[PDB]
């Protein structure tokens, strides 16, 4: 009687949704056709006899990815008319997907959301995935969040956004729409998790020893993180954690809800079994700055609160004996007004392996969600990138001619300045 609905918008969102939906189907024993040859109820729904239907909706204005989905092996799984598709792409223009073509599509998506919500009885909250540096992704994510915040109100929404890397970039105009989308979801999303690609590339290179990774390898790690986060809702555990038990433990103030994640262990089968993978060493590896899932240095800032999930055969006393060691270290310092900052969850189900993938099978794993003061650097560098081109009003004509006003750029800049001032104000000791 506990449910959650995941929203996938944009090319990156759909490509990570595919990645998480192989993993969930594999973890619950459901074949790609949707047929089994009481834990499924969190992500799926029973049709009365036979197949299961995911509680997910796919959105995009550009039809190529959806058409690829509707012809692959998973054509029989998803309901045919929840893969909403458009005709014309926003083409990396934020104003397009927020004012011009997204408005005519958003009504169908909201109707689908209502039709899925009326089925659930214990709706925990929503999940949303969107790559920020694109037109349709950021614009439609902003519009959907704004509609949901007023249609439903206090229901919790979680956002797994992928911000651009510090120096590596695929587009040339992504700072503009990244800043605008951050403006939009700052006052509209309860949790936002950092996911830039460069850090995960470094993780793959160093640990998985892959020298030529593709997007699928990144999306599989993201899917594993999602599964670790939501395992506690569908498996028995000695110390459970619910989604609604987050803003009471990781969010000191309503404005501050951007945090960065990490995962451990990450190791290949060729050298995994030569070492014992004790809980102490994995919880040490999880706190290593080089294993952050976002390219930010935690040594440059304080910690505010750490929520970290275990799964497997871990014993609570071993967890406490390792939290003490971390509190001992002099290179990791917490904020003054937080004496204890750890929330611990323990689950029994070990992580599942996907055949043909990178990760091996292990009995212990740890996933941490940590809120730290050091996150302000990404905001500062994105702001610096934005200012350089906004000084000469470059690329603005592509946005003014799509219905957006001239002054809309300035207030996003002011909100980022306010956020950066707030992060500095919080981190000073009393």
């Amino acid at each position: 009687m506990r449910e959650v609905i995941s929203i996938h918008v944009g090319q990156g969102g759909i490509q990570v949704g595919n990645a998480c939906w192989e993993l969930f189907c594999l973890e619950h024993g459901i074949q790609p056709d949707g047929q089994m040859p009481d834990a499924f109820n969190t992500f799926f729904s029973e049709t009365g006899a036979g197949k299961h239907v995911p509680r997910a909706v796919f959105l995009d204005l550009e039809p190529t990815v959806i058409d690829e989905v509707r012809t692959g092996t998973y054509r029989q799984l998803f309901h045919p008319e929840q893969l909403i598709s458009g005709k014309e792409d926003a083409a990396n223009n934020f104003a397009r997907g927020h004012y011009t073509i997204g408005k005519e599509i958003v009504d169908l998506c909201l109707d689908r959301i209502r039709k899925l919500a009326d089925n659930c009885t214990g709706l925990q909250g929503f999940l949303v995935f969107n790559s920020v540096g694109g037109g349709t992704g950021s614009g439609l994510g902003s519009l959907l969040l704004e509609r949901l915040s007023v249609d439903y109100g206090k229901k919790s929404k979680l956002g797994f956004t992928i911000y651009p890397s510090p120096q590596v970039s695929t587009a040339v105009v992504e700072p503009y729409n990244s800043i605008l989308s951050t403006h939009s979801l700052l006052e509209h999303t309860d949790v936002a998790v950092m996911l830039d690609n460069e850090a995960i590339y470094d993780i793959c290179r160093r640990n998985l020893d892959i020298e030529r990774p593709t997007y699928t390898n990144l999306n599989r790690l993201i899917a594993q993180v999602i599964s670790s986060l939501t395992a506690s809702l569908r498996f028995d555990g000695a110390l459970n954690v619910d989604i609604t038990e987050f803003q009471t433990n990781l969010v000191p103030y309503p404005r501050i809800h951007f945090m960065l994640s990490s995962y451990a262990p990450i190791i290949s089968a060729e050298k995994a079994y030569h070492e014992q993978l004790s809980v102490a060493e994995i919880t040490n590896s999880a706190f290593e700055p080089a294993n952050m899932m976002a390219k930010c240095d935690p040594r440059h800032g304080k910690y505010m609160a750490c929520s970290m999930m275990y799964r497997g055969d871990v014993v609570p006393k071993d967890v406490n004996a390792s939290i003490a060691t971390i509190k001992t270290k002099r290179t990791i310092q917490f904020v003054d007004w937080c004496p204890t900052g750890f929330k611990v969850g323990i689950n029994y189900q070990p992580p599942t392996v996907v055949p043909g993938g990178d990760l091996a099978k292990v009995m212990r794993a740890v996933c941490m969600i940590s809120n730290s003061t050091a996150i302000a650097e990404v905001f500062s560098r994105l702001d610096h990138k934005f200012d350089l081109m906004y000084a000469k009003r470059a690329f603005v004509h592509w946005y003014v001619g799509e219905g957006m006003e001239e002054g809309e750029f300035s207030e996003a800049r002011e909100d980022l300045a306010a956020l950066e001032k707030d992060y500095e104000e919080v981190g000073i000791e009393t």
């Binding site: 702001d383 934005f386 200012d387 906004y390 000084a391 300045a417």
Partner: protein, 49 residues
């Protein structure tokens, strides 16, 4: 600055000697002193946004 405790007669003799060296040898026997002038320049208030 008038800090050199020199008789005026020697001050004139030294200036005449300096002018002679500057005309004949293109060199000054007087050491150049720095004069700092405060100048007020306009800068745009480029908003550091």
């Amino acid at each position: 600055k008038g800090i050199l405790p020199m008789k005026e007669s020697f001050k004139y003799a030294y200036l005449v000697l300096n002018d002679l060296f500057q005309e004949q040898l293109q060199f000054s026997i007087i050491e150049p002193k720095s004069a700092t002038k405060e100048v007020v320049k306009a800068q745009p208030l480029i908003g550091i946004t």
